[PDB]
């Protein structure tokens, strides 16, 4: 699968995704990390968030990080994420996809959702 591929989301990161019809808008060979952090706003702790990628970690470069590492996040998949200090729970070499999809909950057309891995998609 690649950019333009039609797929079915096969994971449940948030409500409304599982089984949603989707189209791939970006594909990245990269390292995908699961991370835990306290949002900058001060709300509830985010535990084992899938996923942030190499390119979303401040000063990560081409250096693969290690579980246990403390990093600063440069993504904004949700409020309070950008600039947060996070702990890497795991690291995996894989391809991740950014997808447009229609929420199964409300019918809202979600654009450029980051991220799902190929293990999390069905074609």
UniProtKB/Swiss-Prot annotation:
Domain of life according to the entry: Bacteria
Disulfide pairings: none
Keyword Signal: yes
Alphabetic keyword roster: Signal
Protein name per the record: Uncharacterized protein YdhK
Species of the source: Bacillus subtilis (strain 168)
